[PDB]
Amino acid sequence: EIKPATGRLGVLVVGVGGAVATTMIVGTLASRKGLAKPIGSITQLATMRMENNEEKLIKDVVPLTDLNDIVFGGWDIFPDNAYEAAMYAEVLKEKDLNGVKDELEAIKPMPAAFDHNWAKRLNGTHIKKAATRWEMVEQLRQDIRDFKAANNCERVVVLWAASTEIYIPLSDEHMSLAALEKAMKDNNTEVISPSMCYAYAAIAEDAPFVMGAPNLCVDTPAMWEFSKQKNVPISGKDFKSGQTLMKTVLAPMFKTRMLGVNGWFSTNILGNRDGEVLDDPDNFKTKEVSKLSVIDTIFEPEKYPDLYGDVYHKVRINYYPPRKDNKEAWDNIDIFGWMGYPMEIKVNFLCRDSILAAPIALDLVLFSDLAMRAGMCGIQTWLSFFCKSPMHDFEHQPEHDLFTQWRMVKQTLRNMIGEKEPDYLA
Amino acid sequence: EIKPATGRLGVLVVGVGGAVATTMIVGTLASRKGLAKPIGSITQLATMRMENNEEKLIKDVVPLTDLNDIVFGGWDIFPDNAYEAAMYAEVLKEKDLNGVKDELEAIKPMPAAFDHNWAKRLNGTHIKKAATRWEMVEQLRQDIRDFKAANNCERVVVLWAASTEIYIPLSDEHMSLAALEKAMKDNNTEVISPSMCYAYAAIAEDAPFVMGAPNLCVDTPAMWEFSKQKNVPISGKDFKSGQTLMKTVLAPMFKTRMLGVNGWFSTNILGNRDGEVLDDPDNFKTKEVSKLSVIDTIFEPEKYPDLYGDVYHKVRINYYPPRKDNKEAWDNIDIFGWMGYPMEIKVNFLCRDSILAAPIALDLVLFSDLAMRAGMCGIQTWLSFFCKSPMHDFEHQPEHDLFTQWRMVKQTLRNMIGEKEPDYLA
Amino acid sequence: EIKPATGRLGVLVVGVGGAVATTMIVGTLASRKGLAKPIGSITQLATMRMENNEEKLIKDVVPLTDLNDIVFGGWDIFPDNAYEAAMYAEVLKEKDLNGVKDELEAIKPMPAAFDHNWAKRLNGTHIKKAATRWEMVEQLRQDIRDFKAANNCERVVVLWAASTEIYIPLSDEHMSLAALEKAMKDNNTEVISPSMCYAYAAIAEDAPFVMGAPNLCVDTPAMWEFSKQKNVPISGKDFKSGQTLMKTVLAPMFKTRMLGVNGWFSTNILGNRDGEVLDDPDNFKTKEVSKLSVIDTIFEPEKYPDLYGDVYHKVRINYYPPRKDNKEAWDNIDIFGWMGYPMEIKVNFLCRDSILAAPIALDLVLFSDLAMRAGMCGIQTWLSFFCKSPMHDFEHQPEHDLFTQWRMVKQTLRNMIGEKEPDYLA
Amino acid sequence: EIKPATGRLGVLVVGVGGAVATTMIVGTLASRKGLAKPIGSITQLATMRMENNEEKLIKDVVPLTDLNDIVFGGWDIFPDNAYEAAMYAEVLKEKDLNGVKDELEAIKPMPAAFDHNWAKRLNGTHIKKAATRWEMVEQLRQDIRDFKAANNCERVVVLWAASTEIYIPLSDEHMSLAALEKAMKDNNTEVISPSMCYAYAAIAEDAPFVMGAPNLCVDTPAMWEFSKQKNVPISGKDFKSGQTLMKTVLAPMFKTRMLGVNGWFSTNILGNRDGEVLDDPDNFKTKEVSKLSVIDTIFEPEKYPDLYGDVYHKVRINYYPPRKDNKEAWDNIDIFGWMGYPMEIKVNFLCRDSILAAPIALDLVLFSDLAMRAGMCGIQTWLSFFCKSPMHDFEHQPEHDLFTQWRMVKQTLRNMIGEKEPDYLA
Ligand SMILES: NC(=O)c1ccc[n+]([C@@H]2O[C@H](COP(=O)([O-])OP(=O)(O)OC[C@H]3O[C@@H](n4cnc5c(N)ncnc54)[C@H](O)[C@@H]3O)[C@@H](O)[C@H]2O)c1
Ligand SMILES: NC(=O)c1ccc[n+]([C@@H]2O[C@H](COP(=O)([O-])OP(=O)(O)OC[C@H]3O[C@@H](n4cnc5c(N)ncnc54)[C@H](O)[C@@H]3O)[C@@H](O)[C@H]2O)c1
Ligand SMILES: NC(=O)c1ccc[n+]([C@@H]2O[C@H](COP(=O)([O-])OP(=O)(O)OC[C@H]3O[C@@H](n4cnc5c(N)ncnc54)[C@H](O)[C@@H]3O)[C@@H](O)[C@H]2O)c1
Ligand SMILES: NC(=O)c1ccc[n+]([C@@H]2O[C@H](COP(=O)([O-])OP(=O)(O)OC[C@H]3O[C@@H](n4cnc5c(N)ncnc54)[C@H](O)[C@@H]3O)[C@@H](O)[C@H]2O)c1
Ligand code: NA
């Protein structure tokens, strides 16, 4: 039984002043007015073959929030409105911003729960004054309540589209809800991320949460416990948009064709606010761990020792101001075929990072809202498709193969309406 | 009921002295003696999840001919034995050839049914003297019969691994078996390819036929009629090994992610005997048509006009002696995402052409032998996976998506033993 | 004695409505008004060390026409004014065109001497009606005279910046001025190019002529004879802007480091009006011959047989609408070092063709005007630097090495003012 | 007055067991026997135009040591002979090693002056037991004396071809010979490199010294003082073989064509013993500083602020075992032309590092020997051509432009025999 998508959906974005957030916002406002097309959006454009073999838009098969019913808001450490912030990001042409300037200028960031130590390269001013991690939680819950009431929203989704936080490991404080709350109250600044405070607030307020950065946040037993108790879906993490998208397509190719891999080198140059943050090696590490993780379970080295027994995998990210938002990736893959003979594949992907990630953020938001109305909660395995590091508990492995991930999306969608695929190939 | 793989399989290769043929041969002889591994071979290495969820090697699920039971022979316009021909091709190191030298030297090409006009840049003289296309057929049937008897083969498969022939269109003479035979007898050398003579002979002699080049041959109503009458499988065409393999992996990626494509340019440089032939524009055309054909049914431009309504697709092949057998591909793909913003992907694939195609030729041969023992005949749709231009009749469309093609392979294999997939994801 | 640059210079451009012509025009108008910088212009920006070791701008060492004293006009088969033509070409942003719109709109093409057969893929109709090649000459001389009088120009230069014409060989009619005139009068439309009619008219009217395309035109004994009789400079041919620029830089590198070259493959993709024309193989050939010619005299294979005795050199140009004016080049160079061991260099040059060629066209024009005021005539060897196929008579070889070519420019400039280089390194 | 090259030259290599050293050795032994060609060697293959315009081999213009008169030896921390070490390095085919195996096996490394702290990733055993830096000096002088006597060498050259040492800055101890000696005696392990001990020993023993790594060593006032006092030439540093060679060719191209540069990103992957050492960031730094230094003096940002006022330059080196000795470089250069419009150049250079550097090491050795016999001493500015970081005192700037560097080589060679260039272009 799926609750219908009635009334307005508040989409509250952490980092609402960021490149990805503003691009998603501009694209949504323009798309719903017929001034642009939501290219790259599964929710808006993709179709599926149904049990009776009819081909339908996914949006016509399950009840999603209509773009016209979305109201955007959120938090940032810079006070600039969505228009000012989009002008700064330099992703979109002025004529695209101008077409929705009226609406953009009216989207204003609330002050952020921020800790300088977690993103050292940023120096914004628009930050809450907040006694403890737990005070951050309480202020954020207030903001959600205020926003819902002021904008007449039936439901909310909270999307983290803010900066990559410093690397931190799993620890004792993350192992249960009680321990996490205690650490929040003691103001444990080392194990409690700002992001965890927004996630807690979101779940406490019946709002699905999406982690679009590679941050340790909802991938902890404490959050699995809380989200399940509250009947809230959590999804993550790290939008899979460009270089990693490609990696989770070519690795399946080598696997499907039983070709061996000796090595895979991946590098990137980018010069945006994302890149500025990632220039701190501590923040780099968080991205690196995520990027590195996507091939092992595809190859399965223990099962195919003669193909993948010895893959040397290395990823690098380089701050490079000339590229701005347009991350450029270069990959070199050393493979081998018949009789062990080696070959090389070079890929140069000239991305527009925020262009690629904008529809992915929209899709995660709209599918998260659907998941809750469909009675789903805890880790949304079915949304692995959208993410570099698909969240999983200690009894499950992440699935990384894009094509298998897409099948998982379709399977859950069909299941939601009590249907099966019309045949194996669909 | 699948007939068991007893006794010896004769594998008769048209172009047995060629780069792909000798590479497949060397690798098979070495593999079966434990001097090399058949990397790239689905038949030898790939596994599948079965109905009860056990994972097994395909070769342990269906009865295939054991490598030890294969005997190689075939035809070429050059008289060199398989050792001399492998040394000429320069694909494999001498240390690899040396390990199986005695067996290679014993593989000697029978004189070919050849027409200089169909492959003008070749000037070998190990050719039959044959008054008519029909006499070519009869001599080829004799050779098959002689080989089976001399080598004590229970069954035969004929693999065309010879040069790409000049472009010719579908014509009246191809539209029924009666018309094709008539044209053979009248010696119509403009509509009857040499390859059609080998295909006819193979089918007439109860031998599955595989077209590993892009030649018009078994993709005609005449051959669909004949193969059905004789209960023989036919498969083709054009081994999908390198640049085109990649095309049928990336195009599914763009499709799965709802990314638009404005254009796709593919070029390559190669300096082998394959390249010598393809330097004739007439022979180039045959390859070009095949390479061009692989994206339309993936994109479906009529269904997604806003993504793929206007793809400019161009392929080039350039003779380049320095590369030898190591074809080098360069591709530039112009794509667009959210709100129509353009991006570019450049792919540089340093192929070893014959290394990539060798396991594909082996797999087509072994699966063709299985298909016949399993009572299958006519167009082997299930082997689309191995081919750039999957054969199809006028009531079916080719499927090009590698991942879907792999599912087609598994589905037929499961069906052969009366099983279903354990679940949608398997 | 160099005649001073007084009064106005008429710069009459064949193909004044083309991508390169309009880009040069816009940039000159904007530069002189301080709305842009003439990046890439030797005349505007380059310096030289003088005999007394002072470093000066070239424009301060020899008397050039000031940008403010240039008046543009010319011919095209499309009647669009320079503004409309610049908007069509899509090289420059509207904000750049807007700054000089009034001046651009006032530049209007005179009807062209055109022969459809020489550029078949173009179908403009702003063409003269002219019974014979000779009548073309006379009408073009009239246009030059009219323009000089109407715009109060002291001097004129004629720049061919129009489409690459079909390949034609040197022939009897080109071997003397008398024979060329005879062929013009007999209306021999097979050996007399339209471009030859513009060149004749320019020379007849005391106007230096620059061939910016690879056309057979002023590289004939007839034009060497005429330009000498009239004391007019002629320069050419084919602006060296992008891929070929790089070729004449890397080949000197391999030479200077005594590295061998086995092969060099050059391809590109472009979708502009240039590309439309070059899609005709006959027009392609003209470009191809020019691009192929630039390495032999650098390598000197007869002198260094062990390095360059066997270079396989191949160039391709591919029409590709998605690229528009932004030609994209890909090169693969196979080199070898110590003990013959091979290595590879891949170059991907994302050009803006008209951006690269614009300053080159301006420099050729301004240096040609200087050359005549300095009493120079016939083949301007010293301007080889700007050209893919430096013009030369039957007793001289072209010099292709960019760095040597630059030295040739400086040497002539120094000589013009009776100076020597201060030292060998300057 | 040039002393003739009589008798045998001892070429003593620090790191005689290394990839570059063994490649140079094998190539020299094979070349002098006509079993291979010394491709890449200026000394062996390059010609020059002389004052009377005759073109001659440099080796026929100045007296160099004949390859037949070279005797190789040196030091390493691994005791393996030159044959064993070359087999380990995997640069050269076995058939090339086999052809000179007899001579190679007879080249045995003397125990090294080594300090683990300066190259932490190496753990060889074949190291001297040496009380102090000064004891290292005295033992090394003994080794040189012993070698000269045992092999009947008239002259010696010492070539450092050993591992890149950790970064260290210039300091007080380097500022005079007296201070350097004092620091050596006090065993100042922090400011005195092992390399400095070999350099001191070489100069003390009348042997020119070449620094083929980027190490601080002879680029100190102390060594300038000593080398001048002893009348010994010193040259360095860091062979310029591959990616940096290219950088000092393309930067001159942009300069010569007045094109602006916004950025230049350079990365590398390599998996050899060199790469193992450079995996330590301290050792990386030494290479990085050297690689970064080569463009500033080419561009001259203060002179051309509108072209080069703001170049973002970044270099990376990545350990990557699959590449072995075959370093692979990728560069992205952001340039701009006319009216400020941006363009991009991508270079992928698949090097064989030791193949490229072997002739450079030979040339520096043979030219160093010539320099001394020609009465030259101190910093050999004229050998800048061969080096990434041309050594210079505090009153001189390095020249990096390859083409200018080549002219400097020719100028010194001509000067040595009292000749001038025949003309400016030669
Ligand atoms: N762009 C892509 O293709 C892509 C792909 C993978 C993941 N991501 C991740 O998405 C996130 C956003 O990307 P972006 O390019 O928009 O970066 P951005 O820096 O432009 O946007 C992030 C915004 O979050 C703000 N912010 C940081 N910490 C905050 C806090 N505690 N509370 C509120 N606001 C905060 C920043 O001030 C900034 O405005 C990053 O983590 C990035 O790595 C993006
Ligand atoms: N190599 C690959 O990766 C690849 C990819 C696509 C398809 N193919 C196709 O496979 C075929 C074989 O490729 P290859 O590289 O081994 O080429 P090859 O030139 O080495 O071909 C094999 C042989 O075919 C022989 N031959 C030609 N016409 C014949 C005839 N009528 N009868 C008998 N023998 C004949 C030739 O003499 C040659 O020795 C070609 O058509 C090629 O285009 C190969
Ligand atoms: N763009 C570059 O970087 C580059 C490099 C090499 C050389 N070139 C050559 O420069 C020329 C101009 O290049 P473009 O990109 O501006 O091309 P374009 O097609 O935009 O050319 C300019 C114009 O020439 C006109 N034209 C053709 N024939 C004519 C005739 N007989 N009389 C008068 N006008 C005529 C066409 O109508 C067109 O508008 C081409 O031949 C091109 O190959 C340009
Ligand atoms: N390969 C190239 O193209 C290239 C280019 C630039 C510079 N270089 C530099 O040249 C040097 C040698 O390069 P390689 O590839 O042969 O590396 P390598 O590691 O193969 O060779 C260096 C050798 O020196 C030895 N060694 C180290 N410290 C020593 C000491 N104190 N005394 C004696 N032996 C010592 C090592 O054990 C090793 O055998 C490195 O500094 C490298 O960075 C080489
Ligand atoms: Na890197």
Author numbering:
A (entry chain B), D (entry chain B): 4 to 239, 241, 241A, 242 to 429
B (entry chain A), C (entry chain A): 4 to 429
Q: What is written in the article reporting this PDB entry?
A:
Recently, the prominent human gut bacterium Bacteroides thetaiotaomicron (BT) was reported to produce inositol lipids and sphingolipids, but the pathways remain ambiguous and their prevalence unclear. We characterized the biosynthetic pathway from myo-inositol-phosphate (MIP) synthesis to phosphoinositol dihydroceramide, determined the crystal structure of the recombinant BT MIP synthase enzyme and identified the phosphatase responsible for the conversion of bacterially-derived phosphatidylinositol phosphate (PIP-DAG) to phosphatidylinositol (PI-DAG).
Outside of the highly conserved ligand binding site, the overall fold and quaternary structure of the representatives of the family in the Protein Data Bank (PDB) is highly conserved, although eukaryotic MIPS proteins have an N-terminal extension that appears to further stabilize the quaternary structure of the protein. Similarly, the iSPTΔBT_1526 strain (lacking the predicted MIPS) failed to produce both PI-DAG and PI-DHC, in accordance with the loss of the myo-inositol-phosphate substrate. Indeed, while SL induction level had little effect on expression of capsular polysaccharide synthesis (CPS) loci in iSPT, iSPTΔBT_1526 had notable upregulation of CPS1 and CPS6. iSPTΔBT_1526 is deficient in inositol lipids (PIP-DAG/PI-DAG/PI-DHC) and any other possible inositol-containing molecules, such as cell surface polysaccharides and components of the capsule. We observed a reduction in fitness for ΔBT_1526 compared with WT. Importantly, deficiency in the ability to produce inositol cannot be rescued by assimilation of inositol from the growth medium and impacts growth both in vitro and in vivo.
